[PDB]
Amino acid sequence: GNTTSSVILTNYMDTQYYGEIGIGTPPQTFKVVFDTGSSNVWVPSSKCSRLYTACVYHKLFDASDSSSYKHNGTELTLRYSTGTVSGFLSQDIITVGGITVTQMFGEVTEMPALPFMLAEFDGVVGMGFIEQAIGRVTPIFDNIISQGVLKEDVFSFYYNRD
Amino acid sequence: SLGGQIVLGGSDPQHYEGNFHYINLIKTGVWQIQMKGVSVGSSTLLCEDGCLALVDTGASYISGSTSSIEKLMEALGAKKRLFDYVVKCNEGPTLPDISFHLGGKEYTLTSADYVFQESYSSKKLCTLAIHAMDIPPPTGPTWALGATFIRKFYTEFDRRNNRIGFALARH
């Protein structure tokens, strides 16, 4: 490859750094943390009841608004200290910087209010390895790697002060 | 002011200075490297033999194990609150450096890099950017270097050579 993708971040109070990504056709846009400590893409679902606080005040992905979406439905779980996170697999087209990628990801249908209600961001994109990935779903950077469009199979972080 | 930046497929020289010092992963499967010591002042108080350093862009803080943290805070002189550690705001700037031994270099965070200096008064408490976190196997037990650390050192994650790269950040 020859291209370099880059994504601007918002620094909320030296504790939360997040940037914009788009899912589907046309793109529905989300604020996410890029996590090297984790390996899955997770966003909130339109199936998340408004009775979940951690959802009501965040953005929700609606598959019913996307012409590119491809159903899977396999159920998947993650265990936090404060409770459990679950939802189901979906596939759609995700855009990060100038990069368009077909990707499997999670739609959350239930998550505890804490700490999730305190995020200014809507979800997470994991920058970790497949070994860690839940359901052994393929991580985003592996699919980016496979396209053959990056100058080098690296990525870097800059975080400002406040 | 730019809050931050993530580059895919390279780095950005405008946001660091120097060249990278690179370290190999204990094992592929996790962005985790070896750490040879944690120092308070110019003495090597903690993780003396060797410990594990998880390099976590998705965390707010530096995190150590309970054991490690009690010992770091004790050395600093901090009071433990329910969810955090605090010092009297007036002695926040009098705080010693904390140094990390990674590869062939000491990585030095100062008082200004790890204390939330909201006041300077003797009658106020100031929060530190360092918390306890017990992580379970096979990834845990480990240290974890989150935003606190990444603010001072610009970080390259290199998948071709399974190595992580450091450089002093520019602001």
Ligand SMILES: COCCCc1ccc(Cl)c(CN(C(=O)[C@H]2CNCC[C@@H]2c2ccc(OCCOc3c(Cl)cc(C)cc3Cl)cc2)C2CC2)c1
């Ligand atoms: C610079 O970013 C630091 C932000 C610190 C922060 C603040 C709030 C939250 Cl809830 C989190 C939660 N996170 C973490 O604690 C990670 C830290 N590394 C190891 C894995 C941890 C993790 C924890 C939870 C997790 O989530 C499952 C589902 O993911 C969601 C999250 Cl985390 C938040 C919202 C609003 C919605 C969804 Cl769908 C995924 C990963 C996610 C990375 C964000 C982190």
Ligand SMILES: *[C@@H]1O[C@H](CO)[C@@H](O)[C@H](O)[C@H]1NC(C)=O
């Ligand atoms: C969804 O994807 C997984 C691979 O992660 C596959 O094993 C599974 O059968 C798929 N489910 C359906 C219903 O197609």
